[PDB]
Write an enzyme that holds these catalytic residues in place. Structure first.
Site, PDB file in Angstrom:
ATOM      1  N   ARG A 332      47.413  -6.379  -3.813  1.00  8.73           N
ATOM      2  CA  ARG A 332      47.819  -7.625  -2.934  1.00  8.73           C
ATOM      3  C   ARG A 332      47.759  -8.871  -3.682  1.00  8.73           C
ATOM      4  N   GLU A 380      59.349  -6.144  13.133  1.00  2.00           N
ATOM      5  CA  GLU A 380      59.541  -5.467  11.741  1.00  2.00           C
ATOM      6  C   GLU A 380      60.817  -4.738  11.328  1.00  2.00           C
ATOM      7  OE1 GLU A 380      56.912  -4.698  13.914  1.00  2.00           O
ATOM      8  OE2 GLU A 380      55.078  -5.469  12.815  1.00  2.00           O
ATOM      9  N   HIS A 430      47.952  -3.116   2.602  1.00  2.00           N
ATOM     10  CA  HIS A 430      46.999  -2.098   3.468  1.00  2.00           C
ATOM     11  C   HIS A 430      47.507  -0.572   3.418  1.00  2.00           C
ATOM     12  CE1 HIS A 430      46.395  -6.251   4.759  1.00  2.00           C
ATOM     13  NE2 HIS A 430      45.325  -5.775   5.470  1.00  2.00           N
TER      14      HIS A 430
END
Ligand SMILES: [Ca+2]
Ligand SMILES: [Ca+2]
Ligand SMILES: [Ca+2]
Ligand SMILES: [Ca+2]
Lengths: 632, 632
Positions: A332, A380, A430
């Site tokens: 990330r 989303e 994640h």
């Protein structure tokens, strides 16, 4: 002299005759919305049938995807390269007139629709693109980017959740040049839709008689002056061999199937005005190019979708720098690092996150859209379909971030990116049980496999910063399909590589650690599990075992490689193979078949710190060695 | 004498101390909503900590999933089996206090939340269950089903599309005993949320001071009399080692971590009132049982989730009848046929479709909820999460239908059905390119694989009516997880079977056609492709080849079978295997490894009539024989 209604009835006639001949499809939208379309397209729409790629054309989106004959009728009537023979091939294999409109295959189709709600979302993206591109490029006396986004939608779109997400955001960003026509044509749907849209900060025009050209024009004129996006609520009632013949006769339409009178074609044809509209804009573009040649060059480049001439060289130099700094960080952080190097080279990048940020990011807002980063909020699906619209519009390379688990909220939009072959970049963080305490509702298991089985989608799961840089570069350079870039929350150790191995990262799958001669065992791993694979390789090599580590950051790319390269990485004669990935095991039978083994997940996760979860689920040195021992 | 605020501050103290000790999680919701919870739970909530399964308890749902310490605090304080040691194990492996609440593992947790928007959807389902069950079972002088559904939600839930879908439907169905508290605690989210909810037909109570117990009570009293579902818009401002200590001191909370004064526990404890509430209801239930013993027996059975004693026998008899009628129909018609046989046996079935119907279906409406079928409208995600709530509530077995492609809209809800181990039945139609003309946006490719990799989900793709009946039966009898039943639009020929083969359908995978001795070739097929597999078997047998057809209607069930049964269907020594399925090929490496072959899909579909698409994509007799020839 044909009336408006007679001209609108040509859409109705072609629609119903096409559906009848195909014995398939539904003429709902064209029957109901034809009068609205006749006003909108003949009196307002700026477009050139001879050049459907004119950069400053108005954009039209049919969100009622099933209404496909409406758009095929309009395109045919106004003079696009879509003939009567195409209409007679509606819904037939490799026709230019598939059952739902498909961008790319048909002149003038601005997006692929069918899945309800996404058309309007795509339109929201197009209006966002126009607003940002205008704010970026326009200058005093040179409003070179200046066009509307018109959309048609129905009850199905209004019921879908995605309508709420994208209308909400369109209100917040004041996309005042988005103008939507709701076909209110009429147990399960009782919303006061106008009031709902006012709550989003839209202007709403209520109770427009959708069969009255004067009312339609008045509404459109109001909408075109609006400071807010506008929803025009159109009341329609026209619509639904015997039933067709009845309606056709009621409409006073006497002509045989597919025959349109010559004066009706004449009054629908847009080639003359279209030519003049684009020519006028070309003259303004040249004036802009004279007054601002650097900007104008950048705009053209970007509209073409071309990268800077030296991006490939700078990016490969960057990949090499990273391979030398040799850091151990969360993938990330490596992503944000890549954006920090690539961002300032790529003013076309339009980032965002379903509320990622690099040093030169500037958020877009209603009052100032000259930015390059969008805060989509907790939306989303809407973010993803909007990004599709941004990509179709031209001028940008959009990317959008959320947790990998919430890919599932946006799943069909991701699929649509792929189907439409658009360069949209999905950033999913994640990516596993490595996220730790948030627990099984957030921990991905099956999502990587879902992405990997999406045709035309490339899914990169980088093992370290070097692979992260290669993945971003490759995704950016891929103009003919989308990419999903998958990042860990936890730290990933740098892997040692020679020059050739760094190069081979771009081949999707490659030999990271090797044995002299044919391996007795091959460890195939991705992402955060490559480090564990290397440990097992170290240990097992000390025992004299001939082991190889293959790092597989992108399966779809690896599969695209030549047979001899594949034989060099995963030789057909070495059946002793172990796949290691903190995701669903079942995917890996593709690479280890029935002779190999898989160390993955076959259940949901748990809420605990990451190290405890990796221990629990068997991502440990000891477990790997055991599996090898069992296998050999 | 503790004030309300002091009692509310116990929630705040425990929340922040738990988060601190875990070094993980977020105390947002408990900080902001504690005063509201103190009113709601102490003054209104009907519940028994000694029996969290009391059928007539009020239901509370925390949709802000991240606010998990709010519910753990409430459950602990009011006397549930959740102690201080559980709170000190927040977010630790196998604690009773995972990072997001998980139904089943923790006394008093009504649903698993985390993925935003779904909590409120679950609550909508629970309120729907109560309203339908009451209309079904209540009689004059016996309001035996009578309880409220209270929910907390925040901005994240409000932004999500699913909120629009489920609030819209809740308005239409007048779920007036659903009462939701919006934590309005404060760039990307500017909706006038109260106006939006009025547009759905909810009552809204604006501007409630979320830190003023008198205002909160007044709102709750109004909501409890409402004829509409009510949204209470609560303005809150409390919330966010140094910062924690500062806030803790500001609140005047002097006590050490995890220490709650004895009088605060005394005033929070609900064991005394809870006992009396459930005892009072038990007395009313007995009165109901005396006046209406047949109904009362049915209610208990249904609340237990038990099937009728003779359902298994009647259903097996039905499966046998179908195997004898031997029809050739769309598996979609066989489903409706199974519902026609099973429906009248199962008054607990609560069907629906994302607007399936059998002869005794009766639609539920606001004015009359005594039905058994819900028209969800074009709301796939909302339907699915609602069904989760229905299943959790008790009293029903819900099923819900949409096109297989639109599983993707509802994907995370399907995953949540599985995670929660609930018996929810998903009916997915139009399962392949066999749907024909609607084209690639509607034609599934990767969706079967997505379902098959969902842990605890069984996915049945029946080859004919016999397998369709077995699949429904098995799904209905499966109380500890969900099932997805996948149906074709096109006709499926009846397959001949002996008694033992019909029995083995329930084993998920079985031998449909066999050779004397070890097969040279095994054709593994599912659903609409089994007929083609049988053709190839016929042809190839005529050539003297020793061939077997294995029909694989449910992979997850087949995998659950014993090793010796599996060896009997797919012997480890027969590597010559061909999988045939109109879906993504990559799944099948699990069953054919690297030695076999796969006849599936590796691209998106096309818009054409089905026979032309099957020809185009290689689902023909000739292509199968070619693949066998190549393989052998
Ligand atoms: Ca009017
Ligand atoms: Ca160059
Ligand atoms: Ca107030
Ligand atoms: Ca029995």
């Amino acid at each position: 002299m044909p009336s408006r209604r007679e001209r609108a009835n040509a859409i109705r006639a072609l629609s119903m005759d096409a559906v009848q001949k195909a014995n398939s499809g539904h003429p709902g939208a064209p029957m109901g919305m034809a009068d609205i379309a006749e006003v909108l397209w003949r009196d307002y729409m700026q477009h050139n049938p001879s050049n459907p790629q004119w950069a400053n054309r108005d954009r039209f989106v049919l969100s009622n995807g099933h209404g496909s004959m409406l758009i095929y009728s309009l395109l045919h009537l106004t003079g696009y390269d879509l003939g009567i023979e195409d209409l007679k091939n509606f819904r037939q294999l490799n026709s230019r007139t598939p059952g739902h409109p498909e961008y790319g295959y048909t002149a003038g189709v601005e997006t692929t629709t069918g899945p309800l709600g996404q058309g309007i979302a795509n339109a929201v993206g197009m209006a966002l693109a126009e607003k940002v591109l205008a704010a970026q490029f326009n200058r005093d006396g040179h409003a070179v980017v200046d066009h509307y986004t018109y959309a048609f939608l129905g009850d199905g779109c209004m019921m879908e959740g995605i309508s709420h997400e994208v209308a909400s955001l369109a209100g917040t960003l004041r996309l005042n040049k988005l103008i939507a026509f709701y076909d209110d044509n009429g147990g399960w749907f009782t919303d006061d839709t106008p009031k709902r849209f006012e709550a989003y900060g839209w202007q709403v025009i209520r109770n427009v008689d959708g069969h009255d050209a004067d009312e339609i024009k008045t509404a459109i004129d109001t909408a075109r002056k609006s400071d807010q996006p506008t929803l025009i609520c159109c009341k329609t009632v026209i619509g639904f061999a015997d039933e067709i013949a009845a309606t056709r006769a009621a409409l006073g339409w006497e002509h045989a199937p597919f025959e349109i009178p010559a004066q009706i074609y004449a009054e629908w044809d847009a080639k003359e005005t279209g030519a003049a509209q684009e020519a006028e804009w070309n003259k303004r573009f040249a004036a802009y190019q004279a007054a601002h040649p650097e900007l104008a060059a950048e705009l053209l480049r970007r509209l073409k979708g071309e990268l800077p001439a030296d991006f490939a060289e700078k990016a490969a130099a960057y990949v090499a720098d990273v391979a030398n700094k040799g850091e151990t960080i969360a993938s990330r952080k490596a992503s944000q690092n890549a954006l920090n190097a690539f961002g300032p080279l790529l003013p076309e990048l339009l980032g965002g996150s379903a509320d990622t940020l690099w040093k030169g990011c500037k958020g877009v807002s209603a009052d100032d859209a000259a930015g390059n980063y969008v805060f989509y909020g907790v939306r989303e699906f809407g973010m993803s379909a909007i990004m599709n619209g941004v990509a179709l519009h031209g001028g940008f390379i959009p990317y959008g971030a959320t947790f990998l688990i919430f890919m599932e909220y946006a799943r069909n939009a991701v699929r649509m990116s792929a189907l439409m072959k658009q360069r949209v970049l999905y950033v999913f963080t994640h990516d596993s049980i490595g996220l730790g305490e948030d627990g099984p509702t957030h921990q991905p298991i099956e999502q990587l496999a879902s992405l990997r089985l999406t045709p035309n989608l490339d899914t990169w799961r980088p093992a370290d910063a070097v692979e992260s840089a290669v993945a971003w570069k490759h995704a950016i350079e891929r103009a003919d399909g989308p990419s999903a870039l998958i990042f860990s929350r936890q730290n990933l150790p740098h892997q040692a590589r020679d020059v050739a191995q760094v190069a081979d990262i771009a081949r999707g799958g490659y030999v990271l650690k090797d044995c002299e001669g044919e391996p007795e065992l091959i460890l195939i791993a991705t992402g955060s599990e490559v480090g564990l694979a290397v440990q097992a390789y170290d240990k097992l090599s000390e025992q004299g075992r001939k082991v190889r580590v293959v790092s597989m950051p992108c399966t779809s790319v690896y599969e695209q490689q030549d047979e001899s390269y594949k034989q060099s990485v995963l030789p057909v004669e070495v059946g002793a193979r172990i796949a290691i990935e903190a995701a669903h095991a079942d995917y890996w039978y593709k690479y280890v078949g029935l002779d190999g083994r898989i160390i993955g997940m076959t259940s949901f996760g748990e809420s605990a710190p990451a190290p405890a979860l990796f221990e629990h689920f068997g991502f440990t040195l000891d477990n790997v060695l055991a599996v090898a021992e069992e296998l050999l």
